Design a protein around this ligand. Structure first.
Ligand SMILES: CN1c2ccc(N)cc2O[C@H]1O
Lengths: 300, 254
């Protein structure tokens, strides 16, 4: 069980760790998060009490290094850093645990929620979407734009999601205009799966990462990407049976986890109505359709 | 974005543009079967592609063979329209290609945009104008070439005949829209008004009669009265009661 120690907490902040969150007071003797489950990516995230515009965080994987958080009073945020000295780090963590100054990652034994949200998400794929090669962890915030949003301005600070555009030469074979526009199977199976993602696991990983950035940071471009990747499957007549069964499970847990009070801003009425009631796959997402109908019947 | 009353002069500037109307592409007669079910029988159709500045009409005849063994024909008709418009643009020399294509029906936007992806600098626009181009098939010579076609055919016409020798494109378009609005509201009455005086003929190379400037004023008046007479006949409205502002508004209204 891994640990992300904090140097200190000089400013009042709501701290998220995956789907959990807790309030830290200004100069509260808080020195980090312990018992973080090995085997998954994690996200530690922040919303300052004095300024909710500051909404930002770090994707990391404790298998890849020893990470800690330290507040920077110049840049005015909690920063993730890597400690290269194994023995200094172990000695820091042991002291803070002895003095019981760390919150425990509060996982219920029965509860597979985080696995179910991150099943296909891999740090090496995150680091290609979020390019900062000198760090093993990835910073995301509420304001970061996507490569696609920036084409319609700083490229170093962008989310490099795979561009999906239904009215693009990439999406439409010369001479198959109506066929490819009304049935996106070509675009899904040949261009995106075989061509760009190489397999459904990489496709689902990016879809799951987009959803989590939408949910945790209110990142608008991430929300657009999540819905585009759902719509591209639902608008294809020809999808492998395993991919439809897996998508239904993925979306079920995403809709289950979404805070009820954010449904209005995080869910696109048109895409969901089209996907569940009009698309080729309208009858292929049993679990998703039942949770959406019971939790968000107004949207539909 | 959308072409409307506010940006009407733009039709007559020097940027090449085409209107595309797809309302006569897929045409059927609905009938009873021997077993008392209902069936459709397709008849020949046409794409109405018009340069409003020059009067140049690209009439692509849609032969019923196009539909043979195809499903969801009203959907296919939009895509076939977009395919043929795309083929027409690619057939034109670069300096003759339109800078904008205005579709008379919003359902044509996605099909045309997808067929014209190769032409990113050609703008595909809807219009807020209610244009009476559906009445094209009430023009005898256009109806005749469509119904006689035995194969796919493109036929080129000038829908203004020689009017541009005497009037501006703005006035020529206004005359065309008034004639087509009249043909659309009461075809019998419109044809009577245009073809009653047998001394005024249609030249072999023209669509409309050879009216003098003064006769066009009389014709145009008779068309506006017909649209009002019919608008009265429709809504049960004493038209002899209406003022000239009241009257002006209803023609443009429609
Ligand atoms: C020169 N004309 C012309 C060229 C192209 C089309 N479609 C029509 C035309 O009517 C003629 O006036």
């Amino acid at each position: 069980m891994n640990t992300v120690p904090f140097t200190s907490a000089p400013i009042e902040v709501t701290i998220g760790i995956d789907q959990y969150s807790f309030n830290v007071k200004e100069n509260q003797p808080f020195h980090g998060i312990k018992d973080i489950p090995i085997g998954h990516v994690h996200v530690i995230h922040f919303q300052h009490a004095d300024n909710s515009s500051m909404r930002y965080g770090y994707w990391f994987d404790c298998r890849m290094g020893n990470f800690y958080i330290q507040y920077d009073p110049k840049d005015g945020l909690y920063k993730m850093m890597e400690e290269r000295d194994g023995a200094k780090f172990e000695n820091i963590v042991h002291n803070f645990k002895e003095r019981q100054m760390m919150v425990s990652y509060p996982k219920i034994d029965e509860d597979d929620t985080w696995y179910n949200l991150t099943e296909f998400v891999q740090m090496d794929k995150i680091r290609k979407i979020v390019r900062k090669d000198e760090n093993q962890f990835s910073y995301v915030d509420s304001s970061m734009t996507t490569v696609q949003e920036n084409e319609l301005s700083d490229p170093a600070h962008s989310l490099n999601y795979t561009v999906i555009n239904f009215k693009s030469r990439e999406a439409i074979r010369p001479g198959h205009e109506m066929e490819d526009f009304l049935d996106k199977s070509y675009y899904l199976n040949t261009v995106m799966l075989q061509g760009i993602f190489k397999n459904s696991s990489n496709y689902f990983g990016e879809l799951q990462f987009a959803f989590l950035n939408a949910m945790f940071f209110g990142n608008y471009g991430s929300s657009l990407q999540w819905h585009a990747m759902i719509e591209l499957i639902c608008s294809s007549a020809t999808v492998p049976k395993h991919m439809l069964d897996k998508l239904d499970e993925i979306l079920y847990y995403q809709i289950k986890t979404l805070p009820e009070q954010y449904s209005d801003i995080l869910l696109n009425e048109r895409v969901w109505n089209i996907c569940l009631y009009s698309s080729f796959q309208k009858n292929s997402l049993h679990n998703t359709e039942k949770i959406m109908e019971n939790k968000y019947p107004e949207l539909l | 974005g959308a072409m409307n009353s506010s940006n009407y002069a733009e039709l007559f500037n020097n940027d090449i543009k085409l209107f595309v109307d797809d309302t006569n592409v897929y045409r059927v007669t609905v009938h009873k079967t021997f077993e008392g079910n209902v069936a459709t029988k397709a008849i020949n159709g046409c794409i109405f592609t018009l340069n409003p500045k020059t009067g140049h009409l690209f009439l692509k005849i849609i032969h019923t063979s196009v539909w043979a063994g195809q499903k969801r024909l009203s959907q296919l008709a939009k895509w076939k329209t977009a395919e043929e418009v795309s083929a027409l643009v690619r057939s034109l020399p670069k300096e003759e290609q339109p800078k904008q294509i205005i579709v008379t029906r919003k359902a044509m936007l996605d099909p045309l945009e997808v067929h014209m992806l190769d032409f990113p600098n050609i703008a595909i626009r809807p219009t807020e104008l209610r244009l009476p181009f559906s009445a094209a098939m009430s023009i005898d010579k256009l109806s005749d070439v469509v119904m006689k076609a035995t194969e796919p055919q493109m036929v080129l016409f000038n829908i203004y005949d020689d009017w541009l020798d005497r009037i501006s494109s703005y006035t020529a378009f206004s005359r065309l829209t008034l004639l087509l609005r009249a043909l659309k509201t009461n075809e019998e009455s419109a044809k009577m008004i245009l073809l009653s005086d047998p001394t005024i003929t249609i030249k072999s190379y023209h669509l409309w009669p050879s009216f003098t400037d003064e006769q066009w004023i009389t014709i145009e008046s008779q068309m506006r009265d017909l649209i009002l007479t019919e608008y009265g006949r429709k809504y049960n409205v004493n038209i002899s009661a209406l003022t000239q502002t009241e009257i002006k508004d209803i023609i443009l209204g429609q």
